[PDB]
Amino acid sequence: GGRDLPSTGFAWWSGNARLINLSGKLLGAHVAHAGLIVFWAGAMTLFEVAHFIPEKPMYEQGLILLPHIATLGWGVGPAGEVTDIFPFFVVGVLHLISSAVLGLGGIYHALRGPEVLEEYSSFFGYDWKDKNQMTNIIGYHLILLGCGALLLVFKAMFFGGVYDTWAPGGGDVRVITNPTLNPAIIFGYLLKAPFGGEGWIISVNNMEDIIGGHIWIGLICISGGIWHILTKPFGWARRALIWSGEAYLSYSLGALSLMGFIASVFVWFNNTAYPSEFYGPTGMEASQSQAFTFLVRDQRLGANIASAQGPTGLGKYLMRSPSGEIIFGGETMRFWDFRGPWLEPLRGPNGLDLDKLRNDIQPWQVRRAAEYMTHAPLGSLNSVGGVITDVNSFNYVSPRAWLATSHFVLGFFFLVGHLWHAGRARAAAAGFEKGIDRETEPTLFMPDLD
Amino acid sequence: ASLWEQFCQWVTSTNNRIYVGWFGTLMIPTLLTATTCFIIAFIAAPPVDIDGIREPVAGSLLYGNNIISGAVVPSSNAIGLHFYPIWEAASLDEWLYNGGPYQLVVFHFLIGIFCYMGRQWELSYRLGMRPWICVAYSAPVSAATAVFLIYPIGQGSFSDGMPLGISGTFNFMIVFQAEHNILMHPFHMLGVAGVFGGSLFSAMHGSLVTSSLVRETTEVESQNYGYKFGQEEETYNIVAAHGYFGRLIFQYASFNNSRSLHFFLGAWPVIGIWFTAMGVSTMAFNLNGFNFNQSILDSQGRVIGTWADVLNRANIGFEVMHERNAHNFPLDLA
Amino acid sequence: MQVNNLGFIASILFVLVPTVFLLILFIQTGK
């Protein structure tokens, strides 16, 4: 393959396009990039471990990888207190070393390995038009992804369990013994409205559902892997889709955009797979906590919070949701769908229960509400916490904010990339990606519009 | 041949005065729905309890608004992010009072504009064009989605979506500045660069082309008649325009390749708008503009003010007055 | 609403006068 514009037709700033038909060089690029990913995982973990104060909560210290390890049940115990710092260190080290290996292999393939793989092996050689080989690679990778899902399942069941923020007696690392294989629940999650109070799959609120859904995902992915190894695309798929390297790239870009959007929403709303113990409160959690904090304080002062009407005539502390449930008053009325382990002991069948509010509120709940209210995911770009009109002395930005913002931005730009590559793949397949041919300009053979 | 094939040939026909296309089969119904509802609501909708405190806000012309003050008011804070279609209201009057028109209009509008972008791709494909006009269009679409969908999602309520009105837009902007300091957010700075620069480059390109027009007319008729639709000959002298501009600044700062010039004209505002859309979308998660309040201290430790502190004073003034009856607790978190 | 008493006539003329200017010029074009 050429390495300049005259012999490839691509400028330097589009130089990776030169790799489209150099399968060995492309494999080298992919393996080296995978090395970059694993390297960042390891290096960032080591950095976070080095910059970790293990008695100050994770979310106060700008940590996004350590919470992922904690949620998996490594190095943490009840309420998420960091027991052993060594598992975080081991995860980081293992990623760093394997990153070295991946980088070496990617460099070998990109710089010295065979340029193309098709005349060296039929197994690893591929052609973008080879629908059977493309589906074979889909199948191998589907099997691998099913294995990874079952790895999560095995960690939750037989290898110490996962962190359950909903654990009775307090959130804790627990072993999931009864994952829900019941397909009704698992796949009705996917049918829930993506709107308030339903929260399509963002609303999964128990480790049993998460682990059972992962068992289902493992089975689906493995069966799809076998299905795609042993079959070729059907006629309908062959007629509807573009079959080219850039087309497959565009399809994956669309997929990635969808996943990035979903993850940003997931981290913003879900406090089960993202326990607030490690990721801090959600915005909804913080608003509810403020309402709870002042309910408790004014009640201790003697306010009859059941009957106190605010300035507008709605209840200051308590009101009804549009469906009748008893909810916190104020602007946090918008957040009445919130559920968190510190608030549910006060919820009755009708919503918030006056009897529990008056004689069941525990000091740990008061402490938790204060903490969550003061760690609301609000902050400046230079990491000044609180509402934007506050002064510089509180250095905090929620990890949920960092993750949600970054993943929304990445999702959008990958949607843009999908549009770019899908349009280009179509135009190249139809043969006009390089401009209108003057001889056969299609519009010139078209009748005038009016 | 078949009825379905004939229908397909019709929808994808490049001979229709307005291209329909498969994306058009979604665009047209949703956009017409949004338009009809918008016109009806802007003219005649009753007041909407936007803040969920039973303090309805009059948006329509018949309830005392002019064109500048009129709006389709966002749905109630009591609704939050809940889906509120007409059939979930006990009555049409209830649906109107809680701001159902806003949700109907916004959801249909957003579907329509995404289908518009798809339709741009589709027609370029049918005409044998290159496919990326829709990519440029993805910048305004991104901004619209940020202000009508992403920001309400991050904030937890469609009540916090931009109102569908002129003064409502201004209200949205002022409160947004009070809560997020968007002016001090670099992505908004990039958006401003995008629009200021886009206007600069529009003026520059238009003026250089107009300046270098080849003489084909007389001083009486419009010089516009010098260009005939569908000529290949160039209607202006790009080399003379390059001579002028490379002498105005210096030679190597002036484009002489029209293709690179037009790529730059496309790319600059589009990238700026993408960045400002992403700025709004990330302030949706309350990652706000820079906060330099009390950054400069004297040696004793007293704060020395800067223009950032003056801006913060303005922000506080906006913040303490906004939604004056909606807040019960000391921190505006929701 | 208690609006400015000249509002309707000002709006009508503001629109109508240039409208009729354009209409005249357009219609006579080609004469």
Binding site: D448, L449 | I43, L61, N66 | -
Partner: peptide, 30 residues
């Protein structure tokens, strides 16, 4: 009654749109 004036100007603008689209000058190649 100012509402009538607002509706009038809005309708004028929309009608202009419809005519500018439906009854436009055809672009012709010659």
């Amino acid at each position: 009654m100012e509402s009538v004036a607002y509706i009038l100007v809005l309708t004028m603008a929309l009608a202009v749109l419809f005519f500018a689209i439906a009854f436009r000058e055809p672009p012709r190649i010659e």
